[PDB]
Design an enzyme around this catalytic site. Sequence first.
Site, PDB file in Angstrom:
ATOM      1  N   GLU A 185     -18.374 -16.857 -21.739  1.00 47.14           N
ATOM      2  CA  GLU A 185     -17.604 -15.607 -21.571  1.00 47.14           C
ATOM      3  C   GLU A 185     -18.350 -14.297 -21.842  1.00 47.14           C
ATOM      4  O   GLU A 185     -17.930 -13.509 -22.700  1.00 47.14           O
ATOM      5  CB  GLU A 185     -16.303 -15.665 -22.404  1.00 47.14           C
ATOM      6  N   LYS A 295      -0.851 -17.714 -34.920  1.00 45.80           N
ATOM      7  CA  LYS A 295      -1.348 -16.770 -35.927  1.00 45.80           C
ATOM      8  C   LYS A 295      -2.825 -16.463 -35.711  1.00 45.80           C
ATOM      9  O   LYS A 295      -3.635 -17.385 -35.610  1.00 45.80           O
ATOM     10  CB  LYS A 295      -1.153 -17.345 -37.332  1.00 45.80           C
TER      11      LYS A 295
END
Length: 393
Positions: A185, A295
């Site tokens: 990425e 989270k």
Amino acid sequence: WDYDNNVIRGVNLGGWFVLEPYMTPSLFEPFQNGNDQSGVPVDEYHWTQTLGKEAALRILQKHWSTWITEQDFKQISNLGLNFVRIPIGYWAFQLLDNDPYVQGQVQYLEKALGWARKNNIRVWIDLHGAPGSQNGFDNSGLRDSYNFQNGDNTQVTLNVLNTIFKKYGGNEYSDVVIGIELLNEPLGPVLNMDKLKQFFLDGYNSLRQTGSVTPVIIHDAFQVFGYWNNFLTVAEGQWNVVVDHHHYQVFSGGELSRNINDHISVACNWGWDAKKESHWNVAGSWSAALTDCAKWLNGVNRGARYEGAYDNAPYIGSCQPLLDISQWSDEHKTDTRRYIEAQLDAFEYTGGWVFWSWKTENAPEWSFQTLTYNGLFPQPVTDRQFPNQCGFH
């Protein structure tokens, strides 16, 4: 491997050699002071730096030796998977002056390659983090920095790749390693794309120059479908090249707000557009997530767009009920199953798929194990409760 006739059905072994707070929150939570998260290290760089070398190594040795073991590889094979992608950071191989990182990952990577061999699983080794960071994501090791193309950081990355090429791109592992992924990425929009192309070209040439015939995997750098069609081509004598596309629908307000039918249409369209491309291509990272509720998914001390708590997104729904798979409504389970099946169909329409990730501590949308055990991920993986949502031919 025959990329023309075989389909990759795999999982990522994420959170193992590169820490990601949302995947193993138990390693970051002791730094919380009550409900205050301002003192929690945001990435592996700051986590190792805060702990110091002795404590970091003691804690990581236990993590590396328990997070993934030979048993996991046996289970991966038993579930009908044939492939794993293994992220590793540059620091496993080489440290910059004053890097806080500790080493020792390589001994476990080599164990993993043996476990793969024993269980008939094929592998990509993926360089997930480059010095200076190629994207500013916490999963690069260093959040909020974008200095991969500055100073000597690109040259250091090429040197690390040469080490990987010599160790794992040769005859010793030719039966297990079916791809070396040059860089996970790179964030195209903030990089110089001409320099990124030169880097991919230099990595390709260096690999082939060692006598390696291993496929080179390039990540699409978040470019539009087809962008890489004219790069590293057969007409120019460049061969065994695969494009890795990543796909999610949870990292912007607009994507999150789609109804389930539109989520499916988008997933099907990934399949139609990938089919048009001129390189072999694999969906090397994707998940079952329809929210960004897990989270710290967006980073330590950042909230979720889903409940209007990050990125100026409008409130869609509360995250609390979605944190535990046992509290999911029947509708959300059904939506999830449809979304998974549509993505599987789209990705098998080309080179196959690699789910992110095999396991998490407590984030079910991102855990192949949890989804499978709860009957939301097809088992066997060809099973369909919602056949032919996309209409491929």
